[PDB]
């Protein structure tokens, strides 16, 4: 694994991903879980599955140029 | 904190500074080095090409100045 590469990490308090039990879920995955970037604070990456993102929602987010805030931070008054 | 001498080879000087990056106007772009307690350096003094600077600013990846990159 090695967390320094960013994939095999605990992305959030409810993070399920573990290289020992992970299996591909999205049609675009091979040996690594799809991840999306949250722009909260200094930023961080979270697994798409941990965010409960449906494939077309995930792919839709990646084709656009919008920022994304994870389920943990999206409701923090971001003024 | 803008007009500090950020490293032994620092070229940013308040009596001579001019915009270099397309995002600069009256102040020098800076990036935060995560070494030890941390410290700020002028991006230009690190010889960072603009796109590298921008990518660093858009990500959550840590940055270490040319002086501290090695452990």
């Amino acid at each position: 694994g090695s967390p320094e590469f960013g994939y095999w990490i605990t992305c959030c308090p409810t993070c399920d991903v573990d290289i020992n039990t992970w299996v591909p879920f999205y049609s675009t995955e091979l040996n690594k879980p799809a991840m999306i970037y949250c722009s909260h604070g200094d930023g961080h990456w979270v697994h798409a599955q941990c965010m409960d993102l449906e494939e077309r929602t995930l792919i839709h987010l990646s084709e656009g140029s919008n920022k994304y805030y994870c389920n943990e931070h999206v409701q923090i008054a971001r003024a | 904190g803008y007009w500090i001498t950020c490293c032994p080879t620092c070229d940013v000087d308040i009596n001579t500074w001019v915009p270099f990056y397309s995002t600069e106007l009256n102040k020098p772009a800076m990036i935060y080095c995560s070494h030890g307690d941390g410290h700020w350096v002028h991006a230009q003094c690190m010889d960072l090409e603009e796109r590298t600077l921008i990518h660093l600013s858009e990500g959550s990846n840590k940055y270490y100045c040319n002086e501290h990159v090695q452990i």
């Binding site: 995955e29 991840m35 999306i36 990646s62 | -």
Partner: peptide
């Protein structure tokens, strides 16, 4: 939004 492992295969 930036993403990883989301490219068409």
């Amino acid at each position: 939004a930036r993403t990883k492992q989301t490219a068409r295969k």
